[PDB]
Design a protein around this nucleic acid. Sequence first.
DNA 1: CGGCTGTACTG
DNA 2: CAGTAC
DNA 3: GCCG
Length: 308
Amino acid sequence: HNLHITEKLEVLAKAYSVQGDKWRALGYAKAINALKSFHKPVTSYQEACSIPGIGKRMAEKIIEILESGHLRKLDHISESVPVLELFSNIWGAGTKTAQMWYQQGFRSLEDIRSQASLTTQQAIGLKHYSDFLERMPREEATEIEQTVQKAAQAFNSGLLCVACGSYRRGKATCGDVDVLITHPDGRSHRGIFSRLLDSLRQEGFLTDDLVKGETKYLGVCRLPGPGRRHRRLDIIVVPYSEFACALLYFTGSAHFNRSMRALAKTKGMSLSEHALSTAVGRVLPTPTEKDVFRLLGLPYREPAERDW
DNA sequence: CGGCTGTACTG
DNA sequence: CAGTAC
DNA sequence: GCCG
Ligand SMILES: Nc1ncnc2c1ncn2[C@@H]1O[C@H](COP(=O)(O)NP(=O)(O)OP(=O)(O)O)[C@@H](O)[C@H]1O
Ligand SMILES: [Mn+2]
Ligand SMILES: [Mn+2]
Ligand SMILES: [Mn+2]
Ligand code: NA
């Protein structure tokens, strides 16, 4: 993991990200995910271009870090960037909102609180600003999953509730909990969603709602008792017929999903949380996750092997 | 030159 | 729709 | 940014 170059790149990568240059930030993200994986630290400016994810521009930049010791572009990073990052860490506010607030003269969360116009979601994000920057211990994610499962299985004991995301990928900490809910009978998943949230809300577990769709919920919960933080909770309810693809999707990682979906498109297919399809298409049968891998000509990967 | 994943709330 | 998010 |  020879990475004294990456450190300086990530500063630039972050800068592009918060300023909304998502594609350049994407290039940097992949160039960096590479350097933290090359066996022996990079030596030659040719050793660079001989790596997947690094080209003429990135290579010559790496050659500036090694040779010179520091990259000059860093010195041209707008001074607004730290403030933009602060604002964009409010849930529900992205690059465009942060830049607008910044143009309006706002510089601190006190400025936002007192003077900014906030959406319903942003007001919740700001209230829980600190909490939402903390990742929870794996054990707390378990407790949250079980709270949801216990409350759901009370409408129907056959309902499957499974924590996906970083949890299923085996991480020691989780930014939130992602709970996928279904029923193996392909039908009992219906007419449950709204009742579930109502009971979780009734028992004081759900504290705030961010997004409420027909089959997806993004919100905020807090386990009972002292010393508890507010945690983000996302729930989706899917018909059993879509279980494997939904599980695959909601497990990720995000970068893994993107790569897998890109691959599917090259093979004349389309992959979503609903189905693996032939391009516009026929829905290919995917009873299990393994079926999706096999249809794409891929060796199966355990969730921990998908942590990209 | 131009895609870089595919989907779904909010207002 | 643009913006934000999973 | 990267790559085809
Ligand atoms: N941009 C995306 N494209 C495709 N799938 C995504 C994307 N973003 C999130 N997902 C899927 O939704 C799941 C939850 O997204 P999350 O935003 O919850 N990220 P996750 O990996 O769980 O990490 P932390 O909660 O511990 O920070 C991800 O693991 C992916 O499986
Ligand atoms: Mn998550
Ligand atoms: Mn999530
Ligand atoms: Mn709190
Ligand atoms: Na945000």
